[PDB]
Amino acid sequence: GPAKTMEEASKRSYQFWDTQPVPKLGEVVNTHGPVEPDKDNIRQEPYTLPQGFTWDALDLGDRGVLKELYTLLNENYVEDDDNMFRFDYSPEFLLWALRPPGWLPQWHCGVRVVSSRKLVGFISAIPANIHIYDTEKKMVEINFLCVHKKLRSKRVAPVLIREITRRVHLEGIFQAVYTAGVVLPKPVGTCRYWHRSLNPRKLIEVKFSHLSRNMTMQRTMKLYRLPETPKTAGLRPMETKDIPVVHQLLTRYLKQFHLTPVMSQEEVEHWFYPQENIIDTFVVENANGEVTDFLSFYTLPSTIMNHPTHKSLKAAYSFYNVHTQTPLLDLMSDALVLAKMKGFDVFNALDLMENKTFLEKLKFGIGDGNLQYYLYNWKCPSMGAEKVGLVLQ
Amino acid sequence: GNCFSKPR
Numbered sequence: 001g002p003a004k005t006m007e008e009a010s011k012r013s014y015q016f017w018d019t020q021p022v023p024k025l026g027e028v029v030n031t032h033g034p035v036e037p038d039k040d041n042i043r044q045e046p047y048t049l050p051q052g053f054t055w056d057a058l059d060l061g062d063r064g065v066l067k068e069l070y071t072l073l074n075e076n077y078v079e080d081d082d083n084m085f086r087f088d089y090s091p092e093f094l095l096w097a098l099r100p101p102g103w104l105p106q107w108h109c110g111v112r113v114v115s116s117r118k119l120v121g122f123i124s125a126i127p128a129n130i131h132i133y134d135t136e137k138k139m140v141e142i143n144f145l146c147v148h149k150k151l152r153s154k155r156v157a158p159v160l161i162r163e164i165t166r167r168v169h170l171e172g173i174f175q176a177v178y179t180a181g182v183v184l185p186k187p188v189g190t191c192r193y194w195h196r197s198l199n200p201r202k203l204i205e206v207k208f209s210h211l212s213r214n215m216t217m218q219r220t221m222k223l224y225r226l227p228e229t230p231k232t233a234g235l236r237p238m239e240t241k242d243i244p245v246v247h248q249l250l251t252r253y254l255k256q257f258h259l260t261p262v263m264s265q266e267e268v269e270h271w272f273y274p275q276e277n278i279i280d281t282f283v284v285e286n287a288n289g290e291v292t293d294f295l296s297f298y299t300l301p302s303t304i305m306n307h308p309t310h311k312s313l314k315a316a317y318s319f320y321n322v323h324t325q326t327p328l329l330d331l332m333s334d335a336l337v338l339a340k341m342k343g344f345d346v347f348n349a350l351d352l353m354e355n356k357t358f359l360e361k362l363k364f365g366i367g368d369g370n371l372q373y374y375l376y377n378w379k380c381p382s383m384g385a386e387k388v389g390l391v392l393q
Numbered sequence: 394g395n396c397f398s399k400p401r
């Protein structure tokens with residue numbers, strides 16, 4: 001029984017989360033710091049799984065194991081509210097998201113059926129330095145918590161969470177950041193997804209979007225039409241020579257927000273250097289040869305379930321967008337043009353950072369999904385979406 | 394995990 005709204009959450013018992021070092025939903029936080037001290041001895045044994053299931057760390061450099069994980073998520077990972085769409089993270093995207101600098105094999109935590117070896121559960125941690133108000137902490141980012149549909153409501157997700165917690169504790173890390181579509185104890189920030197149609201005909205045909213209150217299809221196509229080429233002078237894809245300045249621009253830009261990553265130059269290379277069908281980054285190189293702005297978005301398609309003709313939606317997700325000379329509105333306008341050029345059906349963006357300054361103007365429509373942001377074992381006051389400066393995959 | 398949203 002997961003809770004999507006805060007109303008349905010207030011009427012919920014959290015048997016598992018009540019046992020965890022996170023604030024309760026009711027309380028308001030007036031302080032900053034760990035919920036509980038660091039542990040100086042850690043459980044050495046993996047947590048017990050139900051009979052017939054076993055832990056297995058997944059070597060994602062093995063193409064067959066990576067494909068098993070692709071399939072687990074492709075068939076059992078997050079769906080929309082109406083069970084019409086499901087994320088379809090590609091194998092090569094999963095490698096990008098799960099092997100950033102400092103990744104550890106034991107943090108790719110799989111569950112298998114003992115007899116068949118079928119992969120039926122997964123959770124992941126990756127290291128990340130996180131800036132939270134006035135504190136910088138080494139943390140992990142938790143992602144890809146997935147339980148096979150046939151294994152659900154058997155309390156496997158709490159075991160996955162305790163096991164990854166244990167394995168992260170063994171490396172001396174006691175805080176984590178993560179997001180969820182559901183409300184849990186206790187969001188540090190609530191962000192709302194917005195959507196910018198790029199191929200409205202397809203979106204309406206697959207019932208991803210619907211025709212607005214008093215609008216025809218022909219009108220909808222004209223409303224969402226875009227230029228063929230971006231307009232910003234000197235926009236071009238990011239190259240290796242840009243890694244330092246992109247790191248510099250990002251670091252300085254993120255200082256205005258209250259929850260942000262702190263990336264090394266190697267992490268900037270990993271997260272932004274373009275990879276086709278995974279991550280796109282375009283820089284603005286001005287008339288003096290200086291990079292002054294950049295935009296980026298990652299590729300995350302979805303499966304269209306039970307549909308005879310259209311099988312997939314290609315979605316771009318706004319990543320980090322840094323402006324110092326080009327107006328953010330123009331940057332995001334060129335982002336839409338580039339996504340359209342690259343075959344995307346929709347461009348998604350959260351209402352975090354300064355995104356509210358362009359969402360409505362660029363004809364984004366509000367979504368039905370909130371993205372809650374959470375910290376494990378860290379108390380701090382909650383913040384508005386515009387102070388959240390962290391984007392995950 | 395991420396959240397799958399669609400236009401309200």
Ligand SMILES: CC(C)(COP(=O)(O)OP(=O)(O)OC[C@H]1O[C@@H](n2cnc3c(N)ncnc32)[C@H](O)[C@@H]1OP(=O)(O)O)[C@@H](O)C(=O)NCCC(=O)NCCS
Nearest residue numbers: 014015016017077078145146147152153155156157180394
């Ligand atoms: C999310 C998922 C792993 C939960 O597993 P489940 O079998 O349905 O639920 P379980 O019986 O194992 O245990 C329920 C506990 O896990 C909690 N829980 C449910 N979803 C959670 C989530 N995304 N993150 C953390 N905890 C979650 C529940 O709140 C509950 O704890 P509680 O007693 O404190 O309320 C599973 O539904 C799934 O794989 N869904 C598709 C992919 C997905 O949603 N991944 C997580 C994205 S945030």
Ligand SMILES: *C(=O)CCCCCCCCCCCCC
Nearest residue numbers: 143144145168174175176376394
């Ligand atoms: C999406 O897949 C995120 C799901 C997050 C599940 C809860 C993770 C809680 C923190 C566990 C790690 C703690 C490390 C000290």
Ligand SMILES: [Cl-]
Nearest residue numbers: 058059060061
């Ligand atoms: Cl791996």
Ligand SMILES: [Mg+2]
Nearest residue numbers: 100127128267
């Ligand atoms: Mg990183």
